[PDB]
Amino acid sequence: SLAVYRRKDGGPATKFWESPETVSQLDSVRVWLGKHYKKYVHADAPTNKTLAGLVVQLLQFQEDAFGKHVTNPAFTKLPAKCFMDFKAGGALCHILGAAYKYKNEQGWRRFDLQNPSRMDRNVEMFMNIEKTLVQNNCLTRPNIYLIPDIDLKLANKLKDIIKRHQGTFTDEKSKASHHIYPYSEWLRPVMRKEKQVLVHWGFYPDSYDTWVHSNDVDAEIEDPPIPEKPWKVHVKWILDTDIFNEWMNEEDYEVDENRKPVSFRQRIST
């Protein structure tokens, strides 16, 4: 099986982040930060690789603090896709800008994401990071509509999961991000660099996406579906989110308007 090399944790792929292309991609992030979060980054004058290392520290912190192994975490992991958005006004810029703004506000001499004494203030930073992403339209937490056919006892359990993971639920399908239907081993390649291919493991969150050698994955990378409000997924999308403390990839759980599972892209067996 290829699941041999599946990540056992949602920690950062440090080699991807230290790679020269990624360091190069952060250049526009550094420049954008210098213009719009200037009073918070001017002192530290972060280089491209310093930003890259900060991303590793940030990703490692939320996996250590809010990971699958943590019973009742104080917070839910930020989506891994947020850290993959290197565009000028994108999510990664607001992530780093919020981190530097928060550090300036607390008067910290430096980031210390390994200090157990600073756990609660580091959690506080991530809350400020999530708010910055949401209020700048880079992140939208699920606003969930439960199909009325779901058993009331299950629906109430799903409602508690949704609230414990920064989500809300609504009674008007008009404004729901997701519609949840009753529900009655593979991977998918998502990115290719060098001889490395990033693969997504079915029923695992995006932080568990693993860089593997392209010769072990002959499958073609297909185009991700374009988002049309709302996602139609079944209840295991919410149930699995509670397991990993990280909102699952909707593609793995999608159903059509008759509750039958569908997969826009191909599923490659492990």
Residue numbers in the entry: 27 to 210, 217 to 302
Which sentences from the paper describe this structure?
The BAF155/SMARCC1 subunit is a component of all complexes identified to date, incorporated either as a homodimer or as a heterodimer with its paralog BAF170/SMARCC2. Here we show that the N-terminus of the BAF155/SMARCC1 subunit contains a putative DNA-binding MarR-like domain, a chromodomain and a BRCT domain that are interconnected to each other to form a distinct module. In this structure the chromodomain makes interdomain interactions and has lost its canonical function to bind to methylated lysines.
We therefore set out to determine the structure of the N-terminus of BAF155 using X-ray crystallography. This shows that the this region contains a distinct structural module where the chromodomain, the BRCT domain and a MarR-like domain are interconnected by a complex hydrogen-bond network. Residues 169–287 consist of a BRCT domain with a chromodomain (residues 219–246) inserted between the second and third strands of the canonical fold. The individual domains are linked via a network of hydrogen bonds to form a single structural unit in which a highly conserved stretch of amino acids in the α3-α4 loop and α4 of the BRCT domain plays a central role. Residues 28–33 pack onto the chromodomain, and a main-chain to main-chain hydrogen bond is formed between Leu28 and Ile300 linking the N- and C-termini of the module. The N-terminal residues interact with a region of the chromodomain that in others forms an aromatic cage that binds to methylated lysines. The architecture of the fold produces a cleft containing two deep pockets at the interface between the domains. Computational analysis using PeptiMap18 predicts that the pockets within this cleft could bind to peptides, suggesting that this region mediates protein–protein interactions (PPIs). Six missense mutations of BAF155 identified in patient samples that map to the module are predicted to destabilise its structure as judged by Missense3D19.
